[PDB]
Write a protein that binds this ligand. Structure first.
Ligand SMILES: *[C@@H]1O[C@H](CO)[C@@H](O[C@@H]2O[C@H](CO)[C@@H](O)[C@H](O)[C@H]2NC(C)=O)[C@H](O)[C@H]1NC(C)=O
Ligand SMILES: *[C@@H]1O[C@H](CO)[C@@H](O[C@@H]2O[C@H](CO)[C@@H](O)[C@H](O)[C@H]2NC(C)=O)[C@H](O)[C@H]1NC(C)=O
Ligand SMILES: *[C@@H]1O[C@H](CO)[C@@H](O[C@@H]2O[C@H](CO)[C@@H](O)[C@H](O)[C@H]2NC(C)=O)[C@H](O)[C@H]1NC(C)=O
Ligand SMILES: *[C@@H]1O[C@H](CO)[C@@H](O[C@@H]2O[C@H](CO)[C@@H](O)[C@H](O)[C@H]2NC(C)=O)[C@H](O)[C@H]1NC(C)=O
Ligand SMILES: *[C@@H]1O[C@H](CO)[C@@H](O)[C@H](O)[C@H]1NC(C)=O
Ligand SMILES: *[C@@H]1O[C@H](CO)[C@@H](O)[C@H](O)[C@H]1NC(C)=O
Ligand SMILES: *[C@@H]1O[C@H](CO)[C@@H](O)[C@H](O)[C@H]1NC(C)=O
Lengths: 312, 73, 223
């Protein structure tokens, strides 16, 4: 996971609705939910920072040549498909298909899904056509078998092995790439990590909304009923209890969101490190870029996340 | 004048065909900047680049630069 | 030339730090967040929280204890709630700062005390070295990296066929300038004559795809 949904929750509309007397009573508590609004806005900005740090690592937008002949290796499952009206690779389309008021607002992300797909396409094209050079300066073109010979030399295997088994290695690579799509399509629990974030945020919002029907000791959970049934000197007593309960519920929601945002930021920093090391280069770190000796990585965008295809 | 975006609508900014680096994030790929008025555009991810690839072509640097950058933590 | 480039880069870095006030925005952001949290905590003391007054001395000098107890209790509840909110925010921010400090310590250990092969961990490019610098409540790393430039086109072959044998480059890569063939290191163009001490032989010329014909010099033939 890279980012989560950006939610903005308003004080005066949630705690008090459109009640002026309730707002006048809420002014006595100070600036509690100026702090709450500020914290939620900060989380919202941090989500866009996470997405920018993960995907926006390359400057130029590289493109694959129109004639796609890479010496037996074919990347049709990860390159963008122009036939679809989304410019997504088939695996990205499968990933995007697998994942499923009261003052609450959802701010759209700064980078749309199509723009994230463009970033992923740029990274894939750079990796295919220039190896690891484009991540450390100018993009220097290199034949793909020669690049795989360099990557074979980078794990202690002489480069003549790749040249003497080029078509076998290409066949193995293609078969594994196809099995990735088959495994993702046939297993509904493959994308559990992203679904956990989605479910947690949805559950938190649902509980926050359902807290609006709690009496909190008041005669009624509806503020309009209290206003329509009582005069000020008695209605303020009930409104005080409602304000206390709703304010503490909102504070609980904000604290949970802060902790979960710290979780998501840690995961996004890890994803950015993996994109810098596993994708833009070859990593000697053990088990950092998949089981076995790392050869290369291919990024794929997912709704609120990133999927790495570690070729080892 | 009046422009309709995905993140609501923006009043007081002129919508253009051009694309520049994001200055003030608006949302859903829309950004705003001051040129002399306020313009709203679709942010550009970077300069277009297409490296010439063939099975037998390689590019090798012949010269170098030593670059020093700062990182603050 | 390398020394001149290093000195010029250091001078440019100093000038950029001097002439740009937004360079150190991270530390300023941390300081502003802490100061604003303190200001909000202090300003919370001027809220009635439902009491008759926000000043404890006025409540004490105006009311008897049995009736002032309710007002004091309301003030205590409000102030305790504000203090708990401040403490929780400080704990979360401290956890974030500790994570940043762990990252800084890792960067100091791996970029400064040694040379790091991790990509983009110690600056953009091929990491050469790093210099630490103290900053108020922070650290600034000067990453010195090697950026290749002025590349040019070459025609490359995976192997060289000679005497019915396939030769692969021992360290570099085979290139062609148009008529002749050389072997050069991958990160710098230093062409050299293809000999038997910079290539190794493996198999014949029937397995490799794209192998080309060329003569491999033998240093022993003249003698
Ligand atoms: C690249 O591999 C893909 C695997 O999907 C091949 O695409 C399929 O090719 C078969 C014929 O071999 C067609 O019947 C399918 O319709 C193709 N599928 C799609 C989605 O296009 C593709 O042919 C391979 N490329 C090369 C050059 O061999
Ligand atoms: C490699 O790059 C350096 C600078 O990055 C080049 O040095 C320049 O050389 C020209 C030609 O003599 C001088 O006019 C400049 O003043 C030099 N600049 C510096 C900063 O020293 C160097 O020539 C390049 N090497 C080659 C072979 O082109
Ligand atoms: C490719 O490199 C070869 C080897 O350096 C060049 O051949 C040299 O050409 C120069 C200029 O004509 C002569 O003075 C040398 O005697 C040649 N060397 C040899 C070993 O024959 C060749 O010109 C280069 N080709 C191109 C297109 O740059
Ligand atoms: C590279 O040289 C080899 C010989 O060293 C060439 O192989 C010859 O090919 C011709 C035409 O098919 C045959 O009649 C000969 O018997 C082959 N000789 C040997 C020793 O196998 C090869 O064609 C050359 N390659 C190129 C591209 O010219
Ligand atoms: C922006 O470009 C489109 C091209 O499809 C054009 O129709 C439109 O008029 C342009 N907008 C303005 C404000 O000129
Ligand atoms: C190599 O030749 C191609 C041919 O299209 C050209 O685009 C490219 O600029 C050339 N590379 C260099 C480094 O001059
Ligand atoms: C590069 O492509 C051309 C066009 O098909 C082909 O004739 C040539 O053999 C290829 N080279 C290699 C080394 O595969």
């Amino acid at each position: 996971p890279v980012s989560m949904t950006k939610t903005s929750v308003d004080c005066t509309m949630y705690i008090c609705g459109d009640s002026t007397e309730c707002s006048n009573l809420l002014l006595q508590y100070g600036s509690f939910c100026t702090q709450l609004n500020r914290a939620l806005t900060g989380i919202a900005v941090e989500q866009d920072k996470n997405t920018q740090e993960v995907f926006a690592q390359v400057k130029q937008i590289y493109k694959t040549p129109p004639i796609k002949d890479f010496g037996g290796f074919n990347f049709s499952q990860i390159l963008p498909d122009p036939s679809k009206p989304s410019k997504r690779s088939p695996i990205e389309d499968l990933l995007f298909n697998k994942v499923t008021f009261n003052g609450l607002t959802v701010l759209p992300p700064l980078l749309t899904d199509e723009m994230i797909a463009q970033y992923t396409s740029a990274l894939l094209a750079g990796t295919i056509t220039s190896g690891w050079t484009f991540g450390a300066g100018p993009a220097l073109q290199i034949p793909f078998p020669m690049q795989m010979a360099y990557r074979f030399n980078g794990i202690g295997v002489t480069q003549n092995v790749l040249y003497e088994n080029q078509k076998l290695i290409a066949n193995q690579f293609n078969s594994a790439i196809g099995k990735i799509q088959d495994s993702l399509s046939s297993t509904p629990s493959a994308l559990g990590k992203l679904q956990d974030v989605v479910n947690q945020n949805a559950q938190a919002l649902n509980t926050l909304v359902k807290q609006l029907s709690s009496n909190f000791g008041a005669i009624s959970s509806v503020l309009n009923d209290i206003l329509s049934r009582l005069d000020p000197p008695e209605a303020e007593v009930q409104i005080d209890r409602l304000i206390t309960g709703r304010l503490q519920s909102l504070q609980t929601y904000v604290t949970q969101q802060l902790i979960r945002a710290a979780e998501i930021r840690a995961s996004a920093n890890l994803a950015a490190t993996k994109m810098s090391e596993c994708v833009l280069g070859q990593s000697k770190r053990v088990d950092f870029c998949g089981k076995g000796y790392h050869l290369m990585s291919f990024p794929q965008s997912a709704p609120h996340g990133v999927v790495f295809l570690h070729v080892t | 004048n009046v422009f309709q975006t995905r993140a609501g609508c923006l009043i007081g900014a002129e919508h253009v065909n051009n694309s520049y680096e994001c200055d003030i994030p608006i949302g859903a790929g829309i950004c705003a900047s001051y040129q002399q008025s306020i313009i709203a555009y679709t942010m550009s991810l970077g300069a277009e680049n297409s490296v010439a690839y063939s099975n037998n072509s390689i590019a090798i640097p012949t010269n170098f630069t030593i670059s020093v950058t700062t990182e603050i933590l | 030339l390398i020394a001149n480039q290093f000195n010029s880069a250091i001078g440019k870095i100093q000038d950029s730090l001097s002439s740009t006030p937004s360079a150190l925005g991270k530390l300023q952001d941390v300081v502003n967040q802490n100061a604003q949290a303190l200001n909000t905590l202090v300003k919370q003391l001027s809220s009635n929280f439902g009491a008759i007054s926000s000043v404890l001395n006025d409540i004490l000098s105006r009311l008897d204890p049995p009736e002032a107890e309710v007002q004091i209790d309301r003030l205590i509840t409000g102030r305790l709630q504000s203090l708990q909110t401040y403490v929780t925010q400080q704990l979360i921010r401290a956890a974030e700062i500790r994570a940043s400090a762990n990252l800084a310590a890792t960067k100091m250990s791996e970029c400064v005390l040694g040379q790091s092969k991790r990509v983009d961990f110690c600056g953009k490019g091929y990491h050469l070295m790093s210099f630490p610098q103290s900053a108020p409540h922070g650290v600034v790393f000067l990453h010195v990296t090697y950026v290749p430039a002025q590349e040019k086109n070459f025609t490359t072959a995976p192997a060289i066929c000679h005497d019915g044998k396939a030769h692969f480059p021992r360290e570099g890569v085979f290139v062609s300038n148009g008529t002749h063939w050389f072997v050069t290191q991958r990160n710098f163009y230093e062409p050299q004559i293809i000999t038997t001490d910079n290539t190794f032989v493996s198999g014949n010329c029937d397995v490799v795809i794209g192998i080309v014909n060329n003569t491999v010099y033998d240093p022993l033939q003249p003698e």
